[PDB]
């Protein structure tokens, strides 16, 4: 039952929010499956710092290429991932604390240096503002170490040689199914992995490697690890986060327009003043 | 047999559990035959299919491209890697990622979820004189 | 006729014993493939809920039609 | 006044109150109908012969085989006989069937007779003989004159006079849903949106007020708990879910008391429920205390009376 | 506004006022329908630039607006851009702040009454609604006459 | 006066041969600018055909309106 307005207004509301109701239904299944059957990365970063911290004690004690980074000459930045539609909160606290963490920690005498990635790099950096030195392109739900070879092959010239000594890894994290909290932490500098450096080796303190082979192989491993594990909660906070928004906003927002449906209600009773121009016509 | 645990960690989840005992996997120098009672010795492991004895007489080749070994008091923490890098790979990264984003970059992800969605947001977000016919 | 539209008032307990309690459960079939079926445009990858729906109903319903002057007995 | 669709039916409704009301208090409940089917006066009937009610009601119906005149005449013999019972000593109390006989019949014959009247296809005799026969039904010296108030709107029309007079005209109005029936329960009248003015607010006591708001508040503040919570899950269910699921399910499922309805039709006991285990069970034991109670063995008890004997011996 | 009064009225005199229930309904300061109809002397050989230019950024930029609610009202501030915040920002300030007391219309309320001028209120739309005086907010262009209420209690509060 | 509905009876061939044959602007223009303003009403819809037709169908008639000294001599 409609009229005119009423029945565009009511099949676009229906297909409207069967849309939303199936598409939030898809979007909270497959994030909630492949967030909890991916949420568990913390072998390489559990098994790489905890077995080069708990033995580095011995081995990394006189020389550390991790300690100075680069030299203190620019800031470096990051950008949070979004290629799924409806990312929530990732485009303000993207760049609220992009541009106040790279204007607040660069303004001082300091440059830009940020590493665009996802779908939100190439919008968010260089389409915005700030500094655009690599930007990874496709990326998706599936992260892995293989493809993501730009930000460490772009970033190990500008951390390890003299450029950026102190960075801000700005990236959308989650610690819970619907917090979505962007956390931007100083990377590219010094790990200060000392979960178990305070006591010596035990067994026999020796092997076939050096400062360059524990301090290199251990930062790629560490930031792989860390960078590719952690990029997880930007699809299952976009995905969450439009699911959980198109689920509740598609039951308060465009179902209050089905609302107006009921003064359609009153709008029969409009029908009944038809008859009364046959009181001057057919009635007589 | 069994003895140590010599569990292999991938770069994301875990690639191999349980214990171990005669593994006679090639070290950095080349071809070496340990078992139970080795000390803590961390070398490289490269690419190539190594028999080694799991649990219950279990001798499987585990192959795979990258591997670090990383051996304790008693321990066997083999942290292995997806893809190892040598020559090019990430030689490339430099050039690709800053041509391609010197000027201009796209990028178009899977998005099983999202990408059924456009014949109903874009034919239903359309026509504006119905939607907006709402008096103040 | 319509899936759910066309109803009587007696239903098929008024006939014989084998379309009874045998031969009466069109609201489940078409309710359950109509309804778990329509719905895969945004929502895709049915699990084995749904799947067993599109081939039992579109196969039963396409199926065990009559056509257009088609003499049942 | 009444509401919602199916679920109780008249079987319920005669047979629970023409043997709970007969000898719980002194007085005749009749009925009457006006705009029924041909068919049904020979099957519907034939309840009658079921719960021993054609000894004591007379079903005045006129079908709908006449015309307007003809069949929307029962206005006399309700008012006519149901005056010399309860202007003697007991009680009379009536049943309406719709208002489709009243209404089309009054709005068709006095619109057609060559007159004008109201507006919106309606009649100018609608607030006389709703408002002259709606506060008839009162109570007197001798004797209350009860009703009950069948009136049909017309597919909830707020413009013309069903709503206006169906709601402004009668008191107190309970809706029956098909998911108080649909589960497999006994009373079909849901507890949301079938109250009076009296009964939940600040004008009875500490028992209805006690137990309305309890009542109300646990049962709108717990149906939130099981159906808008079964689409994430279970894992943050904590005492509130717990204790909101298992005392709205077990008191909801278990305050449905049988009446004498399924006594000589069923099988079926329960007599009449009291108001002292209704009122004194339903707002202590009910919200967290005495959790033994499960939903098979409390099922069929006479309101808070038969479900505490049902913990502990079955 | 569909009787006679309505047609007969819009076309035998001069202007077409009307008094909309959405500037009275909404607590500003002149309860008028200033977007139904206007005089003769608005179009652009007996207007100007302050008037030509006044009234196409404020006709453009409250018609975006306004009509902008199918797209930024059930969407919300998702699919937004520099239209919705531009538009709103100056609509929404030009639209709040453009109304003022009258002397009578100061005593019937509870703010104060200040005569304004044409060149405040003609030169004021070209930095309210393009950048320059856009720095001020919901609080500071309620009650404001022109430039001298929106710039002191806005630089002052 | 809006494009679309304004409908000539004779149409083109009541004028000349640069008249009718240099109307071009009509299907094209009315029709693809259209497309760009209702295409876009998803998250940035844009690619090479929304923006290049628009600077020649939208943007050039954009321009070409009649005020109120409208001379065609």
């Given at each position: 039952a409609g009229a005119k307005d009423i029945r565009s207004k009511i099949a676009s509301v229906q297909n409207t929010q069967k849309i939303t109701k199936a598409m939030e239904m898809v979007a909270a299944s497959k994030m909630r499956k492949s967030q909890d059957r991916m949420a568990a990365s913390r072998p390489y970063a559990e098994t790489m710092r905890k077995v080069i911290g708990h033995l580095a004690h011995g081995n990394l004690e006189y020389k550390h290429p991790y300690l100075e980074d680069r030299d203190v000459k620019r800031v470096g930045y990051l950008v949070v991932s979004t290629d799924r539609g409806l990312a929530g909160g990732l485009n303000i606290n993207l760049f609220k604390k992009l541009l106040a963490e790279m204007k607040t920690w660069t303004d001082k005498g300091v440059q830009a240096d940020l590493a665009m990635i996802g779908s939100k790099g190439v919008s968010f950096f260089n389409s915005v503002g700030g500094n655009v030195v690599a930007q990874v392109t496709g990326?998706?739900?599936?992260?892995?170490?293989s493809e993501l070879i730009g930000p460490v092959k772009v970033m190990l010239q500008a951390y390890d040689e003299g450029r950026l000594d102190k960075l801000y890894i700005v990236s959308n994290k989650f610690i819970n199914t619907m917090s979505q909290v962007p956390t931007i932490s100083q990377l590219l500098?010094?790990?200060?992995?000392?979960?178990?450096?305070?006591k010596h080796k035990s067994w026999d303190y020796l092997y076939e490697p050096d400062p360059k082979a524990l301090l290199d192989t251990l930062l790629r491993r560490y930031v792989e690890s860390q960078v590719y594990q952690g990029v997880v909660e930007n699809l299952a906070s976009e995905q969450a986060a439009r699911m959980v928004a198109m689920k509740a906003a598609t039951d308060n927002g465009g179902s209050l327009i089905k609302e107006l449906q009921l003064v359609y209600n009153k709008a029969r009773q409009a029908s009944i003043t038809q008859e009364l121009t046959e009181i001057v016509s057919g009635a007589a | 047999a069994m003895t140590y645990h010599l569990d292999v960690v991938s770069?994301?989840?875990?690639?191999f559990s349980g214990l171990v005992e005669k593994i006679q996997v090639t070290g950095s120098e080349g071809e070496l035959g340990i078992y139970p009672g080795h000390a803590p010795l961390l070398t490289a492991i490269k690419p190539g299919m190594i028999r080694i004895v799991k649990q219950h007489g279990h001798e499987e080749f585990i192959y795979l491209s990258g591997g670090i070994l990383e051996v304790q008091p008693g321990n066997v923490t083999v942290l292995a890697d997806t893809a190892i890098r040598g020559q090019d790979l990430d030689e490339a990264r430099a050039m690709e990622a800053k041509r391609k984003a010197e000027e201009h970059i796209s990028s178009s992800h899977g998005d099983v979820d999202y990408a059924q969605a456009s014949a109903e947001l874009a034919k239903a977000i359309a026509q504006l004189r119905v939607i907006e016919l709402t008096k103040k | 006729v319509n899936p759910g539209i066309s109803v009587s008032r007696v239903g098929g307990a008024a006939q014989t014993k084998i379309m009874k309690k045998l031969s009466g459960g069109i609201r489940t079939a078409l309710a359950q493939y109509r309804e778990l079926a329509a719905?895969?445009?945004?929502?895709?990858?049915?699990?084995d809920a749904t799947r067993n729906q599109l081939d039992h109903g579109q196969k039963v319903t396409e199926l065990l039609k009559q056509k257009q002057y088609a003499p049942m007995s | 006044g009444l509401f919602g669709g199916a679920g109780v039916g008249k079987t319920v409704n005669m047979m629970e109150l023409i043997r709970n009301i007969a000898i719980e208090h002194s007085g005749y409940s009749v009925f009457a109908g006006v705009g029924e089917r041909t068919r049904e006066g020979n099957d519907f009937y034939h309840e009658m012969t079921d719960s021993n009610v054609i000894d004591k009601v007379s079903l005045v119906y006129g079908q709908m085989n006449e015309p307007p005149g003809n069949r929307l005449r029962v206005a006399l013999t309700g008012l006519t006989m149901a005056e010399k019972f309860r202007d003697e000593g007991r009680d009379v109390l009536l049943f309406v069937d719709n208002i489709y006989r009243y209404t089309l019949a009054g709005t068709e014959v006095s619109a057609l007779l060559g007159r004008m009247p109201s507006a919106?296809?309606?009649?100018?005799?609608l607030a006389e003989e709703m408002g002259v026969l709606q506060e008839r039904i009162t109570s007197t010296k001798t004797g209350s004159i009860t009703s009950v108030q069948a009136v049909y709107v017309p597919a909830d029309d707020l413009t013309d006079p069903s709503p206006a007079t169906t709601f402004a005209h009668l008191d107190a109005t309970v809706v029956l849903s098909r998911q108080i029936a649909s589960l497999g329960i006994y009373p079909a009248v849901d507890p949301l949106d079938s109250t009076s003015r009296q009964l939940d607010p600040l004008v009875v006591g500490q028992e209805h007020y006690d137990t309305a708001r309890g009542v109300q508040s646990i049962l709108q503040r717990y149906q939130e708990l099981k159906d808008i919570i079964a689409i994430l899950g279970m894992d943050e269910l904590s005492e509130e879910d717990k204790l909101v699921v298992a005392r709205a399910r077990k008191i909801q499922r278990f305050l449905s008391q049988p009446f004498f309805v399924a006594e000589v039709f069923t099988g079926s006991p329960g007599k009449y429920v009291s108001l002292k285990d209704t009122i004194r069970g339903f707002k202590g034991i009910?919200?967290?205390?005495?959790?033994?109670?499960?939903e098979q063995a409390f099922y069929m008890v006479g309101s808070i009376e038969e479900a505490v004997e049902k913990a502990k011996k079955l």
């Open positions: 990326m998706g739900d599936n992260p892995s170490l500098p010094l790990p200060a992995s000392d979960d178990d450096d305070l | 770069a994301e989840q875990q690639m | 719905f895969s445009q945004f929502a895709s990858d049915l699990d | 919106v296809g309606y009649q100018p005799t009910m919200e967290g205390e005495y959790d033994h109670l499960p």
